[PDB]
């Protein structure tokens, strides 16, 4: 009965474009919206190179996903900018950037308190759980700490639905081994690696330089290192968390939980926080 | 081209219903969503009395408005619960309640800092401005401090679209031209009047027309040009940009609607004031 069209934003409504990130297909700029008087983010194709029709349908697809999948912990899409010269997804601006910045810029963030870390982990879980509970389920398939955005008060917004799929009935460190040996449980594997990354503040497979070596190692059952040096003894519920992580990134996909099951399992741990 | 249906929530997915507010047509309960594992709010019709078909179309209309009008400072609707027994709008839960609670519970909140007050005022303005910039424009027509919800970190969410209209209860927030029934373009400048009263209320932490007991007396007074009191007692000298704010308030609640700004104009005017904050 009830539906809503995604707003179309005229190009002239976007002012003060400044580069935030530039990639292969995806470039992100910050902007002022002239009507709304707020700062926005614009994920757009390169303004210099010609805009191909296959690249055009990709962006409209990603925009449709974001618009359908809106929820407290998913990046809110504000509208689409669809012009002959320009194509861009307009989203809310995230002042604190991506999660990896918080975890790995140790000068800027000397102490990242345990309650915040666990809250971040809980919110990522809640976000992906929502996606998996849509009809049909939406699988993210690109969860990275680089893709978890943080708003003004450090709440999670899941971003980058470029590789996302409807269950129809780049770095490889977050990818389950069955994706490359010569996937329904993909997101939970990534989540386990992210959990490890959040609790350690370390790059997974830091010491391994060749990505093919990581791939062979992972396919043989090697995982990011768990000891006292990587995961310190003072982590709250360290035993549960290690247990959960290791089930989350299990070699056999059947041993890995659903996000519902993962949230059930996490709630004993989160009950002890403020 | 691109559109999204509002999710339909089966009744059994809502657990642990607890009353948050009960009114004439609108009752609000908090709940657990069994799938999503989050606390939600449910704005529903009374579960005891029979659900009339005119009351049913009212709730579906309000839900359609919320779903179309989603934005950073508007209450997010998560879905609709549409059953034979039960009808409810499921929204995000707001832990800090309504704005009036922050302003008027002075034991619970002894000091409410100026930067927070101005941020609240800025966000209300941004919210209503968004509504007015939709096509067609959406006019709220029920702005009260009682209707401005505050999330976990005290950010604004505009709520209660029960009296809202597409362009093309207390009376203290109502412009005098609205008192009596041809209908004109003065119905466009309703929200800005309410905003001016809210601004006064935020800066003073006082009930507008506290000293006037009969609401009809308020109405007569307002129609003759009387407004909430501006002096040192109500609006203290230590308000940042006190002169600008008084000037803005008084233009916002002007007797002639043509003297009142659009929310775009209001945001333009506010940005000199907000530039001096963190």
Residue numbers in the entry:
A (entry chain A): 5 to 173, 188 to 200, 207 to 298
B (entry chain B): 5 to 172, 188 to 200, 202 to 298
Q: How does the study describe this entry?
A:
We successfully crystallised and solved the structures of all three RIP2K samples: the structure of wild-type RIP2K with bound the ATP analogue AMPPCP (β,γ-methylene-adenosine 5′-triphosphate) (RIP2K-AMPPCP), the structure of RIP2KD146N within Staurosporine bound (RIP2KD146N -STAU) and the structure of RIP2KK47R. Crystals of RIP2KD146N have been obtained in the apo state and with AMP-PCP or the promiscuous inhibitor staurosporine bound, without significant differences in the resulting structures. The best crystals diffracted to 2.8 Å resolution and were obtained with staurosporine. Each monomer has an inhibitor molecule bound in the active site, whose configuration presents all the features of a kinase in the active state. Differently from the ligand in the RIP2K-AMPPCP structure, staurosporine is coordinated by Gln150 backbone, while Gln150 sidechain is hydrogen bonded to the Tyr192 phenyl ring in the AS. Differently from the IRAK4-KDD311N structure, we did not observe a possible prone-to-autophosphorylate conformation in cristallo. The AS is close to the loop containing the site of ubiquitination Lys209 (residues 200–210, referred to here as the Lys209 loop), which is also disordered. Both structures crystallised in the tetragonal space group P41212 with a dimer in the asymmetric unit, in agreement with the size exclusion chromatography profile. In agreement with the crystal structure, the data show that RIP2KD146N is a dimer. In support of this, AUC analyses show that RIP2KK47R has a tendency to form tetramers and RIP2KD146N structure show an active dimer without phosphorylation at AS.
NOD1 and NOD2 (Nucleotide-binding oligomerization domain-containing proteins 1 and 2) are cytosolic receptors of the innate immune system, which respond to intracellular fragments of the bacterial peptidoglycans, D-glutamyl-meso-diaminopimelic acid (iE-DAP) and muramyl dipeptide (MPD), respectively. Upon ligand recognition, NOD receptors oligomerise and recruit an adaptor protein, Receptor Interacting protein kinase 2 (RIP2), through interactions of their respective CARD domains. RIP2 also contains an N-terminal dual-specificity ser/tyr kinase domain (RIP2K), which belongs to the TKL kinase family (Tyrosine kinase-like). RIP2 undergoes auto-phosphorylation and K-63 linked ubiquitination at Lys209, becoming a scaffolding protein for downstream effectors.
